[PDB]
Amino acid sequence: YAGFIQEFQSAIISTISEQGIPNGSYAPFVIDDAKNIYIYVSGLAVHTKNIEANPLVNVLFVDDEAKTNQIFARRRLSFDCTATLIERESQKWNQVVDQFQERFGQIIEVLRGLADFRIFQLTPKEGRFVIGFGA
């Protein structure tokens, strides 16, 4: 399944607002040498405001529909995670953003310079991988 994660540029992230309203969105991600997952997200996003209020996040890697012949058997991996804010421009933050820039290119140069985008580490507690039919 780490093979599976490598197929993706982004993760689906499910979060909860201060008022208890669930949200689904997506965020580009990287995984470091120690196999930690990080997302890079806008301060304007509902997902980010949710995470700032409630650190619980479900991370889902699900096959594109184009890859899926039987819709009830969509290959997918999901983790229950806890988010932690990595302090802007710490050495760790710059190392992580460097990995984003390596994956995603010039937009990361712009964002890291001009925008207050957040790096969140998503630490997983439990995962589940479904190939074929699974509820």
Q: What are phi and psi of 98, to 5 degrees?
A: -55, -40
Residue 30 token pair: 């990287």
Give the count of alpha carbons within 13 A of 123, CB side only: 6
* Smallest distance, a copy of itself to C-beta of residue 84, A: 16
Which one, 71 or 91, has the nearer CB to a copy of itself? 71
CB of 64 to a copy of itself, least distance (A): 4
Measured distance CA(8)–CA(104) in Å, rounded: 12
Cβ atoms of 39 and 29 closer than 8 Å: yes
| Cβ proximity to a copy of itself, 46 vs 85, nearer residue | 46
Contact residues toward a copy of itself (CB under 8 A) are 8-10, 12-16, 20-26, 28, 42-46, 48, 54, 56-60, 62, 64-68, 70-72, 74, 76, 78, 80, 104, 107, 135
Shortest Å, Cβ 102 to a copy of itself: 13
Q: Which of 77/86 has CB closer to a copy of itself?
A: 77
Contact (CB, 8 A) for 59 and 81: yes
